[PDB]
Structure 1
Amino acid sequence: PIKLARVTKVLGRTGSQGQCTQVRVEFMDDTSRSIIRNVKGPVREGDVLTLLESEREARRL
């Protein structure tokens, strides 16, 4: 299963070298399910992602 995404907020920079962006992901499946994910590359607020696995949740706490 492939789920599409939104960007609610761009939080900060994670990763070793400062390559990964920590981003708040709203779902495009109508649900207000806000999962925080890590992205590689440039992401601005209002981007729409293609997540391969939606069950995953990135480094919270």
Structure 2
Amino acid sequence: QPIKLARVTKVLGRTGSQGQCTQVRVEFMDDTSRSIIRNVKGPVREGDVLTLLESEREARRL
């Protein structure tokens, strides 16, 4: 597997059971400004660098 990296476009909303995680449409620094909307935990800003060990489960919650 190749592992790829990405920076964050804009912050959508904080979810979880506990409200612990932040749903991040990240972007692709692999390609054009497509993305996957990923569920990152930890303190996070826009433009933060993310290590994507999966580019597949593109999970959307309003």
Q: TM-score range by the shorter chain?
A: 0.7 to 0.9
Deviates more, 1:26-35 or 1:39-48: 26-35
CA-atom RMSD in angstroms? 1.4
Aligned position for 1:60? 61
CA deviation digits over 1:24-61, x for unaligned, max 9?
11111132222211101111011010010112212346
Percent same amino acid among aligned pairs? Answer: 100
Q: TM-score, normalised by structure 2?
A: 0.84
Range 24-33 or range 8-17, more displaced: 24-33
Structure 2: gaps (5+ residues)? none
Q: What CA distance in whole angstroms lies between the structure 2 residues aligned with 1:5 and 1:15?
A: 22
Structure 2 distance, partners of 1:34, 1:60, is: 14
Structure 1 unpaired stretches of 5+:
none
Go from structure 1 to structure 2 and tell me whether the alpha carbon gap of 1:57 and 1:18 turns closer, same or farther (over 3 Å shift).
same
Task: Give runs of ≥4 in structure 1 deviating > 6 Å.
Answer: none
Paired residues, what number? 61
